[PDB]
Each structure stands twice: as C-alpha cells, then as structure tokens.
C-alpha cells in the first residue's frame, strides 16, 4: 500500500509541487483560450480542438460554459475535469443565490473554485485537476470582469489574457496591442481575431475552428451570446481586408 | 532486505522479522527475575539510571491487589499494557465481584498483543512482561513476549544478560518450591545479581522487589524496605 503510493501532495527538495507543474504542462498542451475585457463588455475566444468532418453539431459551445445568468467560463486542459469544475461552479453560484437572493460576484465564485483546487493540491492523496479556467462576467460591485484560474489554485484579474497552446506569444501580442481604457467590443473582437490568427499558425483561420462568446449589458440585464458562424466569417473577412490594406500601404 | 520492514510480510524462511526486532527491543532492557514458592510469588528487578543524578527507572507496577508486573523494553508499551490489565481487573471486580484469575488476564494480554502483528501499519508491542499473581490456584509467574506468546514459568528472567540469571534459577528450581519468603527473595536477588557486571553489586538504589501471596497483597519495596531482604546476602561467588 505504501509502496504503490505516488505521494501527489508532497513537496519537492526544491520546494516545488511536481504534480501541479505537470498539470500546468497539460494545460500548455491544451487548446488556446483567449479573453479580452472592453469598456462595454468582455469576450472569450477559444480554438476548437474538436475539428473533424464526421463530428456532429455541438449544442451550445465546445469549451465555453454558462455558469449563471451573469457569468460564463472557458476551460483548457482535461475535458472531464473541466466538466467536474463547471458543475461545481454552477452549484456554488446557485448556493450563493439561494443564501442571499442576489447573484454571486465573480471573484467570490473564482475564489471558491480555487479553494477547491488548493484543497485537492494540499491533502487527500489525489491527483490535482488539470484545468485552467477563464472567467468573464458582470456584477454590481466591479462591473465587467475577467479572471484566470490555475490548477495550483491561484487566480488573478486581467484586462486581457490567454491560456492554452501558444499562450506566451498571445500574451506578448496582447501586451503590444491592447489599449487599456479605450477598448470597445468591436476593437476587442478585432484584436482577438488577430491574436488567434497569429497563434493558430497550423490551421488557417476559419469560423469552424474558433468559438467566440461575448458578455454585454442591455437595459439592466446581462446578455451572454455565442457568435454565429456568419458573424465570425465576417470578422475574419474584415481582418483579412485590414491585413491586405496594411500590406498595400507599406 | 525487503522482508524486515512490515509485520504483515512473511520471509521465505517462514519468519516475521519485525517480531524478532521487537524481541531484540525486549532483550535490550534491564534484567528482572520472577520466581514463586508454594505460597508466594516474587519479582526482583534491577533498575537503571540514565546518570548519577537521575532516579532509577520504575520497573515494577501495580495491576490489582493480587497481580503485579515487571517490565523490560519500551516503557510506553509497558504502560499501555499495564493500563489495559488494570482495566481488565477493574471490570472483573465490577462484574463478578471477584479477583480476575491471572491466567485469564495473561490470555487477554496475548489476544490483545496478537492483533498488531497481523495488520498493516501496526507494530508489535516492544515490551516483555513478568507477571506475578495469586489466585485460587496459588502463586503464578507468567512471561509475555512481543510475539504475543506467553509462558507459565516456575521461574523466569528477561532483559539484558538474563542467561546467567536463568542458569541460576535452573540450578535452584528444585529448592525454590519449599523455601519461605525470605529464602525465595534471597534466591531471586542472587539470580538478579548474576546478571550484574563484575564491578557492580546489588544495593538499595538499583533494586526493587515485588511480593504477592495468600495473605499478602501485592507490595513493592523500593529504597529502605529493600534493605531487610538485601541484608543477609552473601559475597558474589564469581
């Protein structure tokens, strides 16, 4: 019994947690998830790893999950662990709504899920959840928000961030191109399309390989909608036209 | 090797090494001698001190009015077993209003100590006991081992360098039965002295005596009550 144990929740001689680092490697192997926060909303952009001719139509989204009326999330890593974490997130949101009769603030939900992650990474002898999450939502305290959570249990708020494949290059591109305080929904969508175009080098940018959802406020209500294929095709066409014009001017 | 770290692992030779290591733990302890006559059971234990300023470690403990024990090995295990035996004696006197027979208490001790030697993550009790009791069957001397095996002994010695004491007891076992109290205690003291170094001699500091009998409840003599028994002893035969 003690000889088959792998000691998942023990420190390393360097002070490291090896299983958490390996889960982070798994996150790096996953598809690209992108989130950009604007003045009038916040969006998620994900690369669809489930591409195939014989795959059936997805119901709502491959990797973007609605958590409650005011929040949505995107996942990168192990799919089934992501399903478990999204179910837990929905449960926590509904429990807060039951207790206070108000929607949960985004950071409280992220904190609860990160507490679950840390509890897995500290005790129990079980492997950690190999999922990184991107959270977008709106609440009455801080407005539009964007958070990122790691398998280690850490989290933080961002104006723009990227997880998954080629996350570092996308982060550098966002640092170069994101203008804090001046982004709108259209500018954020164009930036997301450009970032996905540079990051998704192996596959040409087509509407069937990209999942985009936006979160807006309309007459005091939160609207979380996934862009239709024609809208993403028009966005890709606009980006291509801008690329052509920039090439011609130079 | 790979067979000496768990008590649930048999060796290819048919042995369990953890039990033998606990027996070694018992052998590391200081010597104690138990012997009985037709009417008395006597435990003599050679106490040891960590330094010149440290008091000698307790070796003889009270269990009931008719049962006393001397220990060798891990003292925490000895205290655990002593508390268990005290609870058994108290339960017997509560339920049946009679002293618990010594043999039944020893059977309970063996049954309790057998369990840790067959379960993963547990260890044998690294302590050996010498039990002196008096009941309807007369005096009794019992010896328990970490192997959960117990013996009914005419006389016994456990601890460090106990072989010489056992040899002396083998020599005088014929004389033990008809001896009176003082002769029995002197025999036990001589046997205990046989385990001492050449320079070391018995004295009122390192000697403790436990006596039980028909009309005598179990009693321990520690510092100045030892002297009447010690006085009258002869020079070391060498």
């Amino acid at each position: 019994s003690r000889r088959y144990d792998s000691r998942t929740t023990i420190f390393s001689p360097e002070g490291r947690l090896y299983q958490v680092e390996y889960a982070m490697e798994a996150i790096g192997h996953a598809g690209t998830c992108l989130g950009i926060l604007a003045n009038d909303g916040v969006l998620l952009a994900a690369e669809r790893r489930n591409i195939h001719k014989l795959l059936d139509e997805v119901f709502f989204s491959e990797k973007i999950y609605k958590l409650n009326e005011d929040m949505a999330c995107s996942v990168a890593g192990i799919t089934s662990d992501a399903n478990v974490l999204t179910n837990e997130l929905r449960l926590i949101a509904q429990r807060y709504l039951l207790q206070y009769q108000e929607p949960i603030p985004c950071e409280q939900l992220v904190t609860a899920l990160c507490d679950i992650k840390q509890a897995y990474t500290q005790f129990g002898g079980k492997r950690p959840f190999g999922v990184s999450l991107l959270y977008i939502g709106w609440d009455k305290h801080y407005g539009f928000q964007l958070y990122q959570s790691d398998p280690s249990g850490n989290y933080g708020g961002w104006k723009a961030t990227c997880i998954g494949n080629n996350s570092a290059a996308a982060v550098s591109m966002l640092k170069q191109d994101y203008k804090e305080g001046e982004m709108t929904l259209k500018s954020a969508l164009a930036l997301a399309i450009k970032v996905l175009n540079k990051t998704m080098d192996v596959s040409k940018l087509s509407a069937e390989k990209v999942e985009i959802a936006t979160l807006t406020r309309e007459n005091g209500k939160t609207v979380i909608r996934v862009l239709k294929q024609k809208e993403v095709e028009q966005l890709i066409k606009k980006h291509e036209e801008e690329e052509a014009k920039a090439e011609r001017e130079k | 090797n790979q067979y000496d770290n768990d008590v649930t692992v048999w060796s290819p030779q048919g042995r369990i090494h953890q039990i033998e290591y606990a027996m070694e733990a018992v052998k590391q302890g200081s010597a104690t001698v138990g012997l009985k006559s037709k009417t008395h059971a006597v435990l003599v234990a050679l106490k040891r001190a960590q330094s010149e300023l440290a008091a000698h470690q307790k070796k003889i403990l009270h269990v009931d009015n008719h049962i006393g024990i001397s220990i060798a090995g891990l003292t925490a295990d000895a205290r655990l077993l002593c508390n268990f035996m005290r609870q058994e004696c108290l339960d017997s006197r509560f339920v049946f209003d009679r002293p618990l027979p010594v043999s039944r208490l020893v059977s309970l001790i063996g049954s309790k100590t057998q369990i840790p030697t067959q379960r993963y993550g547990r260890r044998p009790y690294g302590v050996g006991l010498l039990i002196a009791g008096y009941d309807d069957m007369g005096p009794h001397i019992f010896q328990t081992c970490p192997s959960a095996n117990y013996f009914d002994c005419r006389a016994m010695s456990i601890g460090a360098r106990s072989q010489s004491a056992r040899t002396y007891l083998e020599r005088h076992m014929s004389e033990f039965m008809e001896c009176n109290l003082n002769e029995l205690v002197k025999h036990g003291l001589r046997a205990l002295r046989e385990t001492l170094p050449a320079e070391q001699d018995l004295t009122t500091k390192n000697v403790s005596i436990g006596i039980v009998g028909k009309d005598l409840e179990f009693t321990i003599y520690d510092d100045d009550d030892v002297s009447p028994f010690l006085e009258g002893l002869e020079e070391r035969p060498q």
Partner: protein
C-alpha cells in the same frame, strides 16, 4: 527515501527509527538546565537570539503549567506547545474533579502518555503522524516537596536531582555532576545553573540571553524579571 518504511517499524537493534530520529533532533535545541534542591527547583534555558530585531520577550522556553509546576523545553518549541496545553488541561481537570493540585509525577506521566500515540493505519484523521521532537523538563513542588522530572519523545520520564537538555547537554551534565550536592540551596543552585549556562552558551550571557524560573514551597511559579536576573548575574 524516507517513505520506504512506516512510522512504526522496529530497527534490527529493537529501536523505533522515528523515536531515535526525534532524539537526534533534540540535540539541535538550546540548552536548558534544571536543578532540584531541598528549597525548590530552578529552571534555566538559553534563549538563543538570532537577530537584534528579534524581541527576546517573545521567546517562551519556560512556561507555567500550574501555580506550582513549571516546564522548560528544548528542541521543537511548536511541537512542545500542544504538550504544554495538554499538561495545563490535565492539571485543571484534576483540580475540577478532585479539588486538589496535581503532583509533578502525575502531570509528567500524563504528558508522556502522548509520546508514542502516532501511526498511519488504524487511526483517525488528524492524529499525530510522528513523535514529538521536544524534550521537556518538569519542575514543581507538591506534597513530596520540590521535584524535577525529565521527559523525552520515547515516552520515558524519570525523576532527576539535576539535569540538562539540549545541544550542550553532554558537557553541561558533567558540570552539573561535579557541582551538585544534596544539601545545595536555591541560591547556590541558581548560581551554578547560570555558571554552567554561561560556560556552554556561545553568546555572552546577559539578562536578555536567558530565562530563569523557580518554584518554592509556598511560592508560586516565579519567572525572574530583568532586574532580578541582572542582580544574579552581577556576581559570576
């Protein structure tokens, strides 16, 4: 490397590995000296200050178990906190049940009964996974007069006329052996303990470098203040 064996395996020599390793860990602690005389028991511990910014008053190496018992610890202090709490709770429970103060030996026995209560299997969650890495020195006054007891992680506890625990215990014990005599007085005991502590301590002895406490018949557990310590160390 440390996980191939359980916490409760005997060595071929008949010793628990974890208990011996705890004994080895004791030697990394600061030196504590306890002397038991006919007028009381004196306890002295080296504080081992590491930085000038560290307040010496925040180091509690001598604690009050009860009004008539004190405890000096060496090794892992955080491990000793739970043992001290258990001792205090036991004394208060005994007072509640029997309307009297505990003897020092009974308190030491109650604390020592916790030493080997560790293990992996057949145990509830939250139980000790390893033995305590701290040796304690219990000094108090009961109906038997002043008494000093020493406890170690193996669970053994013995009465001592004078003893030292910690890194320089071997050197201090020899010094305690020569100076100690049965008819020693409390002043002589305190002076000898301070002399031995000064001899064994690396840093120069002063008021802030050491803790001193005494228990006397009719006098509660008293921790020497800075002025009393400076008075005692005036002659050395």
């Amino acid at each position: 490397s440390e996980y191939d064996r359980g916490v409760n395996t005997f060595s071929p020599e008949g010793r628990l590995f974890q208990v011996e390793y705890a004994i080895e860990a004791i030697k990394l602690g600061s030196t504590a000296i306890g002397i038991q005389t006919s007028e009381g028991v004196c306890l002295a511990v080296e504080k081992r200050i590491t930085s000038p910014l560290m307040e010496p008053s925040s180091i509690e190496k001598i604690v009050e178990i009860d009004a008539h018992i004190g405890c000096a610890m060496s090794g892992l202090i955080a491990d000793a906190k739970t043992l001290i709490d258990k001792a205090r709770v036991e004394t208060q429970n005994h007072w509640f049940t029997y309307n009297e103060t505990m003897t020092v030996e009974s308190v030491t026995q109650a604390v020592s009964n916790l030493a080997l209560q560790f293990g992996e299997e057949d145990a509830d969650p939250g139980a000790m996974s390893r033995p305590f890495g701290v040796a304690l020195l219990f000094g108090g006054v009961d109906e038997k007069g002043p008494q000093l007891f020493h406890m170690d992680p193996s669970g053994t506890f013995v009465q001592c006329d004078a003893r030292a625990i910690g890194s320089a215990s071997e050197g201090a014990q020899s010094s305690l052996q020569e100076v100690y005599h049965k008819s020693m007085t409390l002043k002589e005991a305190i002076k000898s303990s301070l002399i031995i502590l000064k001899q064994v301590m690396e840093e120069k002895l002063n008021a802030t470098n050491i803790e001193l406490a005494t228990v006397q018949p009719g006098q509660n557990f008293h921790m020497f203040t800075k002025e009393e310590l400076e008075e005692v160390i005036k002659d050395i």
